[PDB]
Design a protein around this nucleic acid. Structure first.
Ligand SMILES: [Mg+2]
Ligand SMILES: [Mg+2]
Ligand SMILES: [Mg+2]
Ligand SMILES: [Mg+2]
Lengths: 136, 135
RNA sequence: GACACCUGAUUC
DNA sequence: GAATCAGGTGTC
């Protein structure tokens, strides 16, 4: 197949220091690389929770702007979680991990109370190389 | 913080896998205490492993209690486990490095030591003192 | 096995 | 920027 990148899109990726560890995420214009949104470093979180938050944040960003652009993520886990509207994270829940869980609860609440037209697509890393929203 | 009364070791190579050498130095002085003759074919991690054990033997025979610094997370673990886990092909071309690694492992399995093996915090203190010059 | 995210090094 | 040597966790 000649499946090609849809450039008119939003790509999200997570960046961390450790896992679990410090987690950040951002959404960029797939074509230009321009950062559209970002999250301040969360002291303790996992890669999957971060990828999940990033996609939902993207859904909210595009909906508010009445955009029909699809969202790309290379995380099969986060994509499934958003589809299920449930983040199945094993991260222990306590004072240290209270913030990331608070954000995850907020994202689930959002997914369960809003509809969206956005196609959530799996970034074909093997076919296209690293996703554009990567940190470096 | 940094413990200056210590021995620092590091590997150096040209290619990886490639030619490898290693050395130990007085962390404070910078004085070279030992330096291995270049080995034709080896890996960076095999070299870091040899360097630490060599340092261990060096301190052991002097009944020194000073610690050893290495910036190698891999080699520090191999030493704690008393087992190197290199993926390097084992044959006539790599016989020397493997002979040294086998002997270093055997040394660990035939001696006791008190020497604390510490991780050099490159992120905070800069490059290890036994570092090899660029190029 | 798969999709990810890292950690510490060695070099060219 | 490219390549290789090693150890580790989150999830499906
Ligand atoms: Mg990702
Ligand atoms: Mg990435
Ligand atoms: Mg080193
Ligand atoms: Mg060095």
């Amino acid at each position: 197949a000649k499946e090609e990148i849809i450039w008119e899109s939003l790509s999200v990726d997570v960046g961390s220091q450790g896992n679990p560890g410090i987690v950040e995420y951002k959404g960029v214009d797939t074509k230009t690389g321009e950062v559209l949104f970002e999250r301040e470093p969360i002291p303790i979180g996992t890669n999957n929770m971060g990828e999940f938050l990033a996609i939902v944040h993207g859904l909210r960003y595009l909906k508010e702007r009445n955009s029909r652009k699809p969202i790309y993520s290379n995380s099969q886990t986060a994509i499934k979680w958003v589809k299920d509207k449930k983040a199945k994270s094993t991260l222990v829940r306590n004072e240290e991990t209270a913030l990331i869980w608070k954000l995850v609860d907020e994202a689930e609440e959002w997914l369960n109370t809003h509809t969206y037209e956005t196609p959530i697509l799996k970034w074909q890393t093997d076919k296209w190389g690293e996703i554009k929203a990567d940190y470096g």
